[PDB]
């Protein structure tokens, strides 16, 4: 929850992350996406599409409680993000969490 959001903010500040669906899909195909976050308000078709790729590529998937706007606010960007991937957590330890 709050710890996950803090770890995500630290990962976005230090590590490498792609807060985009196409970028996350490319990272999942390449296998470099260790962890991914999917917004609750995302369509079920898109959520299942990310889940299938995550299972194929052996990547952790976390369902954020908030909507796309809430996910964007947590990420600190000025636009809502429906899905994000963290290739490297940097100083953050969100990979274990």
Partner 1 sequence: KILKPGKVALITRGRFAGKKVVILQAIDQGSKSHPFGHAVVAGVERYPLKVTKSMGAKRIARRSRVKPFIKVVNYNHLMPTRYALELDNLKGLITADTFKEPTQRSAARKTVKKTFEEKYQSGKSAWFFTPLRF
Partner 2 sequence: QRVTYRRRLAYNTRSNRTRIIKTPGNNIRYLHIKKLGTIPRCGDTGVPLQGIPALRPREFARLSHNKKTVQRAYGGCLSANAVKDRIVRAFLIEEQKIVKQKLKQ
Estimate to the nearest angstrom the gap between the alpha carbon of 27 and the chain centroid. 11
Question: What does the alpha-carbon distance between residue 61 and residue 51 come to, in Å, rounded to a whole number?
Answer: 7
CB of 45 to partner 1, least distance (A): 13
CA atoms within 13 A on the CB side of 11: 27
Q: Is position 52 an interface residue for partner 2 (rule: CB under 8 A)?
A: yes
Q: Is position 45 an interface residue for partner 2 (rule: CB under 8 A)?
A: yes
Q: Is position 28 an interface residue for RNA (rule: CB under 7 A)?
A: no
Q: Residues interacting with partner 1, by CB under 8 A?
A: 22, 25-26, 28-31, 53, 56-57
Q: What is the largest CA-CA distance in the chain?
A: 33
Q: Which is nearer to partner 2, 51 or 70 (CB)?
A: 51
Contact with RNA (CB under 7 A): which of 9, 10, 16, 23?
23
Question: What does the alpha-carbon distance between residue 90 and residue 78 come to, in Å, rounded to a whole number?
Answer: 22
């Amino acid at each position: 929850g709050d710890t996950i959001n803090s770890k995500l903010a630290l990962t976005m500040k230090s590590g490498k992350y792609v807060l985009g669906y196409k970028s996350t899909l490319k990272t999942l195909r390449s296998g470099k996406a260790k962890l991914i976050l999917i917004a609750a308000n995302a369509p079920p078709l898109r959520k299942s599409e990310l889940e299938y790729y995550a299972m194929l590529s052996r990547c952790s998937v976390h369902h954020y409680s908030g909507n796309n706007i809430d996910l964007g606010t947590a990420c600190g960007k000025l636009f809502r993000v429906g899905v994000l991937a963290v290739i490297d957590a940097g100083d953050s330890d969100i990979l274990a969490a």
